[PDB]
Amino acid sequence: MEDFVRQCFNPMIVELAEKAMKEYGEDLKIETNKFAAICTHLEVCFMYSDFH
Amino acid sequence: QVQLQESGGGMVQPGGSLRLSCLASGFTFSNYAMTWVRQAPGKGPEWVSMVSNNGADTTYTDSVKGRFTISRDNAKNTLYLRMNNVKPEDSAVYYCAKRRYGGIWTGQPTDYDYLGQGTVT
Amino acid sequence: EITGTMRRLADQSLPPNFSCLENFRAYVDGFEPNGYIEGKLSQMSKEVNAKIEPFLKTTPRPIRLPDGPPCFQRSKFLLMDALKLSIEDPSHEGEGIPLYDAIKCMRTFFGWKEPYIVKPHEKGINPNYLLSWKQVLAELQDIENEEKIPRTKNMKKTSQLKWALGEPELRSLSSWIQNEFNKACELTDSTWIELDEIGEDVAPIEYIASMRRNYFTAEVSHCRATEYIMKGVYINTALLNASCAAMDDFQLIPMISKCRTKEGRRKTNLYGFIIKGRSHLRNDTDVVNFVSMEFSLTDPRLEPHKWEKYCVLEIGDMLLRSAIGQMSRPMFLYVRTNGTSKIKMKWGMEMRRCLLQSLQQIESMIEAESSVKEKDMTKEFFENKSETWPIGESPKGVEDGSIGKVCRTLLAKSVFNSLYASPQLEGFSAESRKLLLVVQALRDNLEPGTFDLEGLYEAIEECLINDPWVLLNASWFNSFLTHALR
Amino acid sequence: MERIKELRNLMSQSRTREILTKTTVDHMAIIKKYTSGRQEKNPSLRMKWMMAMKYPITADKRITEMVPERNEQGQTLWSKMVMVSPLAVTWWNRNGPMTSTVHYPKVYKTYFEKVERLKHGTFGPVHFRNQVKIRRRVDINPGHADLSAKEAQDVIMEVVFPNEVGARILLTITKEKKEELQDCKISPLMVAYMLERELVRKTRFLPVAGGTSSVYIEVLHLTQGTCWEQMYTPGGEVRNDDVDQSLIIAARNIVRRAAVSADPLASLLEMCHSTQIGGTRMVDILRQNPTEEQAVDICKAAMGLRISSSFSFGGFTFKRTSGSSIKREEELLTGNLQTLKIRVHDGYEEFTMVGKRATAILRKATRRLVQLIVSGRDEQSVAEAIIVAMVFSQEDCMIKAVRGDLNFVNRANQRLNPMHQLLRHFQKDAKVLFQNWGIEHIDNVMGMIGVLPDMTPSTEMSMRGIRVSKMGVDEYSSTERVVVSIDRFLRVRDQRGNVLLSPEEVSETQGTEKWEINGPESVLV
Amino acid sequence: MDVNPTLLFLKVPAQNAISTTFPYTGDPPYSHGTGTGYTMDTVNRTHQYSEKGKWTTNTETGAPQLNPIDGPLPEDNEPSGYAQTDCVLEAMAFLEESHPGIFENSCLETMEVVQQTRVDRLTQGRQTYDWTLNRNQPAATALANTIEVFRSNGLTANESGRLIDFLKDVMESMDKEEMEITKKQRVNKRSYLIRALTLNTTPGMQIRGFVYFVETLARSICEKLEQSGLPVGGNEKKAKLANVVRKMMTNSQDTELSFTITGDNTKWNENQNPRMFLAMITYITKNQPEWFRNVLSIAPIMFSNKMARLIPAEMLASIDLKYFNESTRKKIEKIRPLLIDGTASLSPGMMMGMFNMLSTVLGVSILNLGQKRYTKTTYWWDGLQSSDDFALIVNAPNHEGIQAGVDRFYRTCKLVGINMSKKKSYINRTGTFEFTSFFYRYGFVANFSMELPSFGVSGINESADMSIGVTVIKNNMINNDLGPATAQMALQLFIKDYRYTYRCHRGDTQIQTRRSFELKKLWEQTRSKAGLLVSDGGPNLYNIRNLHIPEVCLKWELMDEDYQGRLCNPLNPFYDAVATTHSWIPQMYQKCCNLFEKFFPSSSYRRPVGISSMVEAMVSRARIDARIDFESGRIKKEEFAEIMKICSTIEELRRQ
């Protein structure tokens, strides 16, 4: 799961989600689905806001 | 040097047996397949049998199946041929020869070396 | 989740100190490697210990052997005493109909005396066997009254045949199993093998592989154990192939083998007949009964205990050649009742492994002992008759033999292990490998030792009851320990 | 209309209508594996019983107008009810529809490749020997252009079933295969199996005794055995043993250039993005290539990828076998009266170091070397291995053997860490520590010899605590994957406090490639 | 003269020829092919190794259970199933201290497995036990029975496909009072509990997933331990034996004495207590999320309260003690109060072939406790562990303390439930020993699984069978190592079998089966003879050099051009397969799957991806195919209209 998430995304969104996960003691090793959901959220926001 | 001296032949009566031996010297024996090729007086030669290096793949003519048994012993580098139920038409001069390649079926039966002798009944 | 009616099992699975498994989980969360082991050791009794008993050449005592009645023969078919009925026919083995081959076997022998019962079963209806034999001969000669030849004769549901199909004690070692194995190790006149061709001989190892396997075949082809393997193959194959289509009626299956004498002519041999019961084989453990009637020339009156499961019928007289002309020795018929199943036949239709198992367990020896070589010692294994192998002890002394004797000896060992296959032999082999390894480590002088050697002796004596093959191996092992400077 | 009619007469029964309704497509594979599972009744014996029967083979209905009913000898090979006798095969095999379908050797190329390797596969002598197993990690596929399984089965779906291709709608082999075998299809499923067998790589751990390439492994039954060996060169070579080398060279050069950069991380990433390797892009290759090399691992770490616990030192990648550690900083005096602060590895530790041309197993105590088993190829190679081993040993013995000022500099004129300074000093002249290490008596057992300071093997004498293995040390490449913590200067730590790797040990082979490093013509263009 | 083959060991040592001692290649007739009484002996022996007054009547099954864990210490040397809890936890903690956080990486891999695992990984296995019929059935059959009987009730969580949802269904199932099985009407909650914990010879249907998870964790553990060489097969064990030798004997300044024991643990598998496994799993699941500990803790609790499936056995409750012999009477006496409702109760038990890898983990722990750091003494040991057959090497500076180290090993083994067999064990000096049929004498021989394959045909096809035979020969030549000449003999034996099975001998011999005429005419009309397939009466040129090439490609060069054009023609009516591909003559899920595959060919090759229902995809595919073969292709408009009317009939039908 984790390697695939790190595969299909740019390292900037990966770094953003990794820092945003150290916020509430939510360890990313266990909440990997939360990792995928947050990365999806950030890329959705970015591709939503781009070129406008 | 490569020489093939054969023996064991002689006169026999029809319906009997014979054990032809062929001694080869001068080359690596266990590597090459061997052949018995006979020639009747008046008719060109015809291959009698082709035997492998392992001694497991053997092939005879369409008219000698069941009557013959070809084999070889790698220790003394020698070739044995057992002929049983000698028909009158098997009366020809038999020849021991060393195949071009180490195979049996790769290429049609032809040889590239010398010869010894062969008896007639 | 782990809710009630399940946590109730979780709460009952803890060691006898807690009630809620959460207490145990919190106790596991905090653990202290303080050295509880040393306290537990000082608390445990000093008698709980692995006391090493030394192992010198004085410790091994010969194996205890059972005493009592002599062990008889339980093999499925006769090995050495059965004799062949040759036809020397080049039939091309074109699925040669196995029944008519047997009737032209019978066409080759004359001199059938009146069936004279000689040795009874010592328990049960003995004359039913000879009545069944008369029925056999009748239904054999009652084919010419049929407008159509059947390829397989379905025997009538006669009461004697119904009875023949059924519709531990400590037995001491006997003297004959060694002789059976010896005649299995002897050389014969025939070949018994159709070893199919193999491709060209490319250089590196296929030359070596050839000069190994063809040497082994030439030293093994004419062995009697090869005949035994082919015999078992043919009998079990015919039995199985009949057990499908003859699911209701008794079929007559000839014990036929094929070979080639040194004159190089195909020969068909007959050992006897076998009457099959019903073959409603639902599972692989389903039992099908059978009756074996095998020809022979060995009188049971010589060794009567061997034929305990047998009823013997003096069945005729044949021409017999000997060192002095003809002798005309009597021809006997051994009849026994037994049972087999699908697995019992398939282990016996795959008997050719006994060659492979031989070759590799020869080839194994040709690798390890030859691994210590820059250029491997492969031809020096053979062609050096000075190197002898110890295989026999007749005159209170080691009688070493040549190499082919060893090859055929290992082949016959595998053959008898397959035919006399018994879980007792399995256990004995498993438990004797250990003592052999200990003795071998002592031979290299590596100061070995055990804990309970008497326990191993107990375990070995627990699996020595009645099988003659196991007991022969046990006496062999005792003689081996005797001649190992021990 | 047959399929949809089956659907209709199937959807009327309720207990199947419900399951066709609820379960989705994603899960068909989880419902395909629901079988009765009993037809395992001696397949050889049932096969023989059916072959003994008349006409056991079942074919289609087009043989009625294709083969005759009775052959040249009146043999029956048909039926009616459609059973077929096996002799019918041999008839159609003799004189039937002869076709130019000899086009075959393009879909089955993966086998004729082996055939051709056997043709000019010159053989050699059999120097028998006690062959010892080398636990190596090798690939088992020849000539596949290094394509991963997912993108390869995507190419499969593209080339064999275009009307149901996958949903990724954002690649030259696709063109080649769709072009050359367009209308000459044989059996779609078997074609897909053949191309998935040809194009997909797979590298795993195998015990080998000298085989490196893919061609040297597919014939392992001829080369290796219990106690034998055959020198066999299959007169050829493949792409998948000299393609990953191009990526290795690219990573080496990229790191060597980024070490000079003011921002090594951003410059290295901008180079990796703007680099092409044989028609491809570097980022996807690094995401999917399982090649193990320091620079490659640095590039992977630059994008936050898990890699091994590699305790890389001097080009030798280390793997921990057992033992813990504690930092416990400590001061030390040199052999030239120089203070050095150092991270004294306390506790008991066990390591296995895998190198380029040599490997070893080490058991080491706090600043004391207990046991070390080494094996290499060249005399100087095992010498370098023993040098880096002694450097990592941290004993006081090697501390005393330091002679001269310790000023060794990076390409950017930087202070190297003390350990690497010692190693770089010892790598040029190490003859000071050998005669100052210590000699001991050994027993010359089990092909384990000792070495002398004068580059000489010895039977009963060796250096203190050393063992030289015959015919190779067993390698172990343990699989461990953990997240990395890259900094701006290309030094990676394992997030717990271990510096994993650094560029100070990258360069040994300037491979000739089988952004101003190419010719000035390339700078202009 | 008289013949004795074993005497051969006087000229050649044992390890050079130990393969002769192995009597059988395949399997002999099993003496216990039946039998309900020897199981009683197993039960009573298991309860004999645990008699320490720790009886507790279960709260939900009423079956008495023994709790001999951390019970009284043994006073006798005989096998005893009393292992102290603190000893087990201390050994596990010391393993973790020797390998930092290895358990956590193994747990991460186990979490990845439990996340990705569908229910298919529950079908890959041998025969299973269906509790629905109280009978042994194949895996998928019992699985589908359980699925249908759960769908009959209100348990439909496995519809997602993840095995964890099937486990959730299993959990919810044990809580229901009534269990109606499909005129059929069946048992209550209590009998359901009894069947759910019932084992045979063979795990229940529910426990298989949980045992798979525990074994995946044990696999991730054993892969990362050098001293545990169980998951590997073949030469890997060779290397793992050749390494530890140099790890022990090669000690500089040689005063050390290195002894090696080849041991075995008698009836060890019956002494491993499931509660101790619960404890060691709980310690392995330290600080992990609670749900994961709860998932992995299922199987040991099920084995703590587990029932053993045994005139039927169920009538053994109501009988007088005269109808049996003395020995059988005593054996039944000691089991009467334990059995309930025709099911035996076995608390401290564990069945052979369940936790072999976790047991190996425990053994490797008790092995690593001797690296001279946890012994605090001179002697130090290291070894290789299997399920029961372990091998140990202990090094000590003097021959006086080596027995003390052996005693430490045996005592600590007794402390963790490892009863070392004083019979099936022997010590010697380092350089010659045994480990799970692997033998070492300064060299190697690999007769572990040397049960050479089925020499005969595998029986599926003509080319598939030949390729299978030669490939298995090559595999046994590299994997289960055999010699080359033996490979030649086995190959020609298989070729003989394949020729006599398929009525294809050759066109060079005169022997004639039901087929040889056509083969010989084929030989006569062929020019270059070597190219002929064996199925087509050709010479066998397969040897060790070409044991890997499929038959077609090797002979492909040597065939005749007409032969090639007539052989491989895919427009034929019948590894590499050609027109000589027989497909010989030989209902809920597979029917749907086959119809789906007929709709989508890719479904037979790659696992499909799609959220729509099966019917919704099939209807659209049918409609599009109808459109395309109507417009560009050729089809009658009426057939199209009937296709779409049936499709709309389904559209109205899938809504009800």
GROMACS .gro file of N, CA, C and O in nm, chain E residues 74 95 98 123 135 154 165 168 178 182 228 236 243 261 304 403 464 470 580 585 598 648:
model
   88
 1258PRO      N    1   0.875  -3.056   3.699
 1258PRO     CA    2   0.885  -3.202   3.691
 1258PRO      C    3   0.995  -3.255   3.781
 1258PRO      O    4   1.102  -3.195   3.796
 1279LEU      N    5   1.504  -1.324   2.262
 1279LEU     CA    6   1.514  -1.325   2.117
 1279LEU      C    7   1.498  -1.184   2.061
 1279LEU      O    8   1.578  -1.139   1.978
 1282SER      N    9   1.797  -0.988   2.109
 1282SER     CA   10   1.904  -1.025   2.016
 1282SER      C   11   1.879  -0.972   1.876
 1282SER      O   12   1.974  -0.950   1.800
 1307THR      N   13  -0.877  -2.138  -0.017
 1307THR     CA   14  -0.898  -2.256  -0.099
 1307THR      C   15  -0.769  -2.330  -0.131
 1307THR      O   16  -0.773  -2.452  -0.153
 1319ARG      N   17  -1.835  -3.378   0.837
 1319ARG     CA   18  -1.765  -3.468   0.748
 1319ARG      C   19  -1.652  -3.394   0.679
 1319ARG      O   20  -1.656  -3.272   0.663
 1338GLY      N   21  -2.849  -1.432   0.905
 1338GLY     CA   22  -2.817  -1.292   0.886
 1338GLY      C   23  -2.669  -1.260   0.893
 1338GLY      O   24  -2.629  -1.169   0.966
 1349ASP      N   25  -1.347  -1.016   0.652
 1349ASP     CA   26  -1.492  -1.011   0.665
 1349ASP      C   27  -1.551  -1.150   0.687
 1349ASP      O   28  -1.649  -1.165   0.761
 1352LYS      N   29  -1.501  -1.198   1.049
 1352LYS     CA   30  -1.604  -1.125   1.121
 1352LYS      C   31  -1.736  -1.202   1.120
 1352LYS      O   32  -1.808  -1.206   1.221
 1362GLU      N   33  -2.993  -1.999   1.766
 1362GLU     CA   34  -3.044  -2.100   1.675
 1362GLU      C   35  -2.958  -2.107   1.549
 1362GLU      O   36  -2.906  -2.005   1.503
 1366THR      N   37  -2.989  -2.551   0.584
 1366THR     CA   38  -3.068  -2.590   0.468
 1366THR      C   39  -2.990  -2.684   0.377
 1366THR      O   40  -2.874  -2.658   0.343
 1412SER      N   41   1.692  -2.063   1.148
 1412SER     CA   42   1.568  -2.131   1.114
 1412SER      C   43   1.563  -2.148   0.962
 1412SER      O   44   1.529  -2.055   0.890
 1420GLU      N   45   1.942  -2.444  -0.009
 1420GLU     CA   46   1.946  -2.341   0.094
 1420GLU      C   47   1.980  -2.402   0.229
 1420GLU      O   48   2.062  -2.348   0.305
 1427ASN      N   49   2.736  -2.309   0.689
 1427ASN     CA   50   2.778  -2.184   0.753
 1427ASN      C   51   2.802  -2.204   0.903
 1427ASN      O   52   2.907  -2.165   0.956
 1445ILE      N   53   2.523  -3.240   1.840
 1445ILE     CA   54   2.419  -3.336   1.870
 1445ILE      C   55   2.316  -3.331   1.758
 1445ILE      O   56   2.282  -3.222   1.708
 1488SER      N   57  -0.725  -2.373   2.275
 1488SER     CA   58  -0.738  -2.394   2.419
 1488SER      C   59  -0.869  -2.462   2.453
 1488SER      O   60  -0.873  -2.550   2.540
 1587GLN      N   61   2.887  -3.149   2.887
 1587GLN     CA   62   2.765  -3.210   2.939
 1587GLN      C   63   2.683  -3.110   3.018
 1587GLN      O   64   2.560  -3.118   3.018
 1648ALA      N   65   0.198  -3.172  -2.323
 1648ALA     CA   66   0.201  -3.125  -2.186
 1648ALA      C   67   0.262  -3.230  -2.094
 1648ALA      O   68   0.342  -3.196  -2.006
 1654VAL      N   69   0.990  -3.401  -1.841
 1654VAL     CA   70   1.128  -3.355  -1.851
 1654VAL      C   71   1.155  -3.237  -1.758
 1654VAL      O   72   1.264  -3.225  -1.701
 1764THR      N   73  -0.173  -3.144  -3.199
 1764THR     CA   74  -0.171  -3.263  -3.115
 1764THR      C   75  -0.189  -3.218  -2.969
 1764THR      O   76  -0.097  -3.218  -2.888
 1769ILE      N   77  -1.180  -3.665  -2.291
 1769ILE     CA   78  -1.318  -3.661  -2.242
 1769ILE      C   79  -1.317  -3.675  -2.090
 1769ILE      O   80  -1.251  -3.766  -2.037
 1782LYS      N   81  -1.679  -1.634  -2.127
 1782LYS     CA   82  -1.724  -1.634  -2.266
 1782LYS      C   83  -1.762  -1.494  -2.311
 1782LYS      O   84  -1.749  -1.461  -2.429
 1832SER      N   85  -3.351  -0.655  -2.247
 1832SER     CA   86  -3.445  -0.573  -2.171
 1832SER      C   87  -3.529  -0.658  -2.076
 1832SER      O   88  -3.570  -0.611  -1.969
   0.00000   0.00000   0.00000
